[PDB]
Amino acid sequence: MQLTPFLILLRKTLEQLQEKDTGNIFSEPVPLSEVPDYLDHIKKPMDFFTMKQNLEAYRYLNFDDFEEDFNLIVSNCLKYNAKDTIFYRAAVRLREQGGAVLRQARRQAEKM
């Protein structure tokens, strides 16, 4: 646990993104057992737990790779689900609120 300012920032940012997911519907992988066709359409599933595991294994080297995985959580959800669903509407809201979190966090990352 030799921390860096960058990794601390990513940890804080991930917590701020998860706070926007008040129903915790993006906290864990979409359960493939409950949805057997998910991988037929979604090439790379993503969720906040997987992102936390990547972070704790020190696999995010820059802000772009971190943001790319967040964007997968949203875009996977919009792709798989019909527009008139709780999941789709939640992904739209997360894109909006999470985008603001990422804008502020990238500004802090830029001055590192």
Ligand SMILES: CC(C)Cc1ccc(S(=O)(=O)Nc2cc3c(cc2N2CCOCC2)n(C)c(=O)c(=O)n3C)cc1
């Ligand atoms: C009206 C609804 C909300 C009723 C309902 C339907 C299915 C399921 S579920 O048991 O299949 N779990 C599930 C599938 C998801 C999903 C997220 C969850 N969870 C993850 C853990 O918190 C609980 C919800 N998300 C984010 C997707 O984007 C997506 O495509 N699917 C398939 C649960 C609840």
